[PDB]
Structures are given as C-alpha cells and as structure tokens.
Design a binder for this molecule. Structure first.
Ligand SMILES: Nc1ccc(C#Cc2cccc(C(=O)Nc3cccc(C(F)(F)F)c3)c2)cn1
Length: 287
C-alpha cells in the first residue's frame, strides 16, 4: 500500500467508470503516475464499484494490459495508481495522424504513420486479448477509445466505462437497460445480451477496422442505431442480407479477409487471438 502523502496532484486526465484520473508526481523511490480517485459526488454505491474495480485489475499482469502499480493505505481515501500513458487515448492519437505516402521519407516527429506501424499497434492489442483469453476474462467493451498509448507506440488495453460524454454516440441507451456499444457487438450479443471470448473477437475485428481507418469514421457511420440492431436480426435469419464494414483504404484484401472471419455468424469459426496475433505480426508483412 502506498501512502497518499507521497502524491502531488498535477492535472486532470479524464473520467473513468467510477472515478476521475489525475496525473501525479512521486518523489520517493520526478516520476509521473496516473491516479484514479472517487468523484466528488461519490456515494456508497460508487465506493463499492471502485473497490471491485481494484479487485478486477489485480488479476491483470501483461505488457499490453493496464497494470495496477499500487493502492492507497487503508486509512487514506481510496486511490488506484497506474502507469501514466504519455500519448493518451488511442482513438485521439490515431485521429491526429495520417498514413504516410512514401515509406521512411519524413523526419522524426512528423504527424504520419506507416502501414507496418498500424500492424504493430493491432498486433499488441491482439496479444493483450490473447492474454485475457487465457484467464477466461471477457472484456465486453473492446474499442480504440479504451486503449492507451505510451512511448514508442506501446499499447495497453484499458476500460474507461460507458458514461463519457466524448464517446456518448458509441453507446445505445434505453431507460432501465444495460448501455450497449452496439456498433462493436456480435449479432448474438445484440439479440441476447450476453458476452463471450468469441464476441470479444468480433469486437477486435471492429477495433482493427478502426485502426486501419485511422479512427476517421464511426463503424456503420451512415446507418442509424436501429439499422445496426436490425442487422443483427439479419445475421440470425442467415438469408444473405446481413452487411459488414467495408475495406479501409489502408487495408489490403488479405488482411480484410481476416477481419471478415472475426464477423463469422458461428462463434467457433471466428479466429482465436493466438492466430490473429500471428497474422498481424508475420503474415501481414507479405507482398
Ligand atoms: N494518459 C493516461 C490517461 C488515463 C490513464 C488511466 C487510467 C486508469 C486508471 C484506473 C483504472 C483504469 C482502467 O482501465 N480500469 C479497468 C477496469 C476494468 C477492466 C479493465 C481492463 F484492463 F480489463 F480492461 C480496466 C485506467 C493513464 N494514462
């Protein structure tokens, strides 16, 4: 347990599910960490959710998953301490880049990104998801808005919840029901509301689509929420009328066919993360 008195709060980094995240400095053995604390309006229910989030995160020990560095001492107000990811949100990060025209033509720091770097980003996500699958842990909300970027394009999977204003349009809300990220959801999750490792694979396919789009458009962006939900009914009925995300400009056909396998009607035909990682790290380099 880490004494709260060793922390110096510096700036607000954003909201989390049941708290708010601040950049902090630590003097003891100028190190920067990210610290989540309870929101100023926190109730008994928020505190309970916060304590359970600490327990969930203590399960997670992988280079491409966020890690809990410590918690505050029992007498202190509740805090969670994690790595400060210098480049922040992956969706906002990729939105600030464009695909390079000629390979290895720019100066260091140019706002461009290469096709092999897009594969490196997606491979790291697949490796973190492979790890969660070995714990039989189901994420339930994989998307670029829930991934973080550190130095040298290192990627960690995280989970900031479904209540942030910046991504409100990514969730479907009906009074009295669970909030749903429908444009990332497998057809069986839309229809029956339960989540599995195989539906995490489907969401990974959408996340991979996002990366190759450089986060320039929402999945199914020209269709309404109601049409996205009806599309799940067309997967169920299986009469060849369902529709899929289109091939991104940066995406060659061979990689697109892997994305299409993530969206198979049958869960067992979707590729495991071990095979998705191997394609992105090796086969995708082929000409
Ligand atoms: N620049 C920046 C900006 C923000 C941050 C941060 C942060 C932070 C703090 C506390 C908890 C979590 C979190 O992801 N919780 C969480 C809950 C359930 C499941 C999972 C799972 F890992 F499985 F995805 C993760 C993130 C760092 N650096």
């Amino acid at each position: 347990d880490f004494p709260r008195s060793r922390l110096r709060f510096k700036e607000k980094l954003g909201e989390g599910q049941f708290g708010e995240v601040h950049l902090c400095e630590v003097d003891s053995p100028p190190l920067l960490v990210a610290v989540k604390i309870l929101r100023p309006d926190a109730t008994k229910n928020a505190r309970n959710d916060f304590l359970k989030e600490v327990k969930i995160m203590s399960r997670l020990k992988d280079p491409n998953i966020i890690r809990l560095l410590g918690v505050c001492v029992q007498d202190d107000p509740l805090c969670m301490i994690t790595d400060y990811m210098e480049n922040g949100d992956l969706n906002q990060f990729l939105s600030a880049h464009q695909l390079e025209d000629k390979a290895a033509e720019g100066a260091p720091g140019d706002p461009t990104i290469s096709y092999p770097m897009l594969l490196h980003v997606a491979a790291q996500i697949a490796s973190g998801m492979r790890y969660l699958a070995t714990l039989n842990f189901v994420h339930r909300d994989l998307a670029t808005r829930n991934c973080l970027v550190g130095e040298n394009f290192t990627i960690k999977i995280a989970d900031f919840g479904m209540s942030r204003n910046l991504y409100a349009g990514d969730y479907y809300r009906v009074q009295g029901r669970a909030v749903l990220p429908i444009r990332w959801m497998a057809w069986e999750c839309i229809l029956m509301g339960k989540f599995t490792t195989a539906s995490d694979v489907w969401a990974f396919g959408v996340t991979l689509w996002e990366v190759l789009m450089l986060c320039r458009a929402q999945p199914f962006g020209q269709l309404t929420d109601e049409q996205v939900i009806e599309n799940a009914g067309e997967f169920f009925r299986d009469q060849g009328r369902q529709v899929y995300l289109s091939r991104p400009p940066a995406c060659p056909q061979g990689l697109y066919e892997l994305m299409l396998r993530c969206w198979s009607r049958e869960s067992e035909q979707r590729p495991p993360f071990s095979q998705l990682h191997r394609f992105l790290a090796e086969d995708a380099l082929n000409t």
